[PDB]
Amino acid sequence: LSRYASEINIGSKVNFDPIDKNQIQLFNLESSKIEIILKNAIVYNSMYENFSTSFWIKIPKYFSKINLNNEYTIINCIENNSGWKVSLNYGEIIWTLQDNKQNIQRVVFKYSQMVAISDYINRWIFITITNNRLNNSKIYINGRLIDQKPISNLGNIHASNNIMFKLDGCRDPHRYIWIKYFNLFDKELNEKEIKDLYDNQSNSGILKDFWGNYLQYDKPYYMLNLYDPNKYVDVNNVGIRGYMYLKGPRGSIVTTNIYLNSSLYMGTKFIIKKYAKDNIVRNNDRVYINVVVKNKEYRLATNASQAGVEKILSVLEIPDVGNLSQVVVMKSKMNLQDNNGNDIGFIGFHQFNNIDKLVASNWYNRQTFGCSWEFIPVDDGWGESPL
Ligand SMILES: CC(=O)N[C@H]1[C@H]([C@H](O)[C@H](O)CO)O[C@@](O[C@@H]2[C@@H](O)[C@H](O)O[C@H](CO)[C@@H]2O)(C(=O)O)C[C@@H]1O
């Protein structure tokens, strides 16, 4: 789907996401490419006309020293040494402009791999790049302005007729990217236009996992509580006599001079089960939550007749749930309901004798709280090994 091109050439080694066919995976392989041939009107050739581009990208973590000092192109629109391109490097997204007089200007976005929880590593991020031929070129990340450089000294920019989506110059043989929702604009977008594009293309009716992919059923997720991200979920004991609690701190995954992050595959995984025709978790879906303890699934539930508004959650055997409250209404996070269809509360945590146990409390519904979760599945772009 491209309203900019008359011909779309797809190499034999382009992979498409089966759950979300909008997502395109381009490998560091020579047939892993998509060339689009712009319509004659969309082709850029001017000294004064402003233009802007936007796209979503998910960049896997850089794992080794073979990734340092290796700027490689991913989106190429340069012909006869003139035009624009998007390139990548170790912890960098790079925008480059070239005129017909060997003038070059680069605008760069930088993110670190030496952070506990990154917002960019192996996660979908919205990139917007805007260009005002009378002053500056700007790069936005998730709608926030990051950096800007002057381009007014650049003469005529005759871009290419084609746009080549392909990893070019990359020395990492395992390297790939995910890309979707490429767009071109014949104006300099302002912050509000970028803000609206970011929200419009977010698919707010579908829940997303930690990496930005669609939330799915029968997919094991490691849980992260956004109020205190240094904790992970554990199960004291299975049965109505045990509870779920948040214990910390998280571990570390390290590779010297490359990355130092918190480990994400920690704690008892959650598995979302269907209750009330695909494997996509949408807003207001009523689902079941299964929790694995020692490689065995059990049903998350509680006894809402317990004292206090904070209803401590237990992990019971599925055949032995009885009439205990278990239905969860997913929301884009988890609103546990009783069998009467009434809210018991958003799933969060509450301190009980120095133990931050997971509770379902309507105090959240009344009122970032302890009910803010992220679902972290195993992903090749992260690289960690599940313990
Ligand atoms: C005590 C503390 O430092 N933090 C609280 C936190 C804050 O009250 C608030 O979210 C700051 O923005 O809120 C959390 O705790 C809640 C309790 O304060 C409340 O009485 O009961 C809640 C459960 O029904 C919940 O435990 C939270 O938002 O989860 C965490 C912490 O206690």
Residue numbers in the entry: 891 to 1166, 1170 to 1225, 1236 to 1270, 1277 to 1296
Give the original sentences from the paper that presented this experimental model:
Botulinum neurotoxins (BoNT) cause the potentially fatal neuroparalytic disease botulism that arises due to proteolysis of a SNARE protein. Each BoNT is comprised of three domains: a cell binding domain (HC), a translocation domain (HN), and a catalytic (Zn2+ endopeptidase) domain (LC). The HC is responsible for neuronal specificity by targeting both a protein and ganglioside receptor at the neuromuscular junction.
Several attempts to crystallise HC/A5 with GD1a did not yield crystals for the complex. Consequently, a smaller ganglioside, GM1b, which is identical to GD1a in terms of the expected binding portion (Sia5-GalNAc3) but lacks only Sia6, was used for co-crystallisation with HC/A5. For molecule A, some additional weak electron density was observed at the GBS that was not part of the protein. Further refinement of the Gal4 molecule with occupancies 0.6 and 1 generated average B-factors of 60.74 Å2 and 61.97 Å2, respectively, indicating that GM1b is bound at low occupancy. The low occupancy of GM1b, and multiple failed attempts of co-crystallising HC/A5 with GD1a, suggested a low affinity to the Sia-Gal-GalNAc moiety or preference for a different ganglioside.
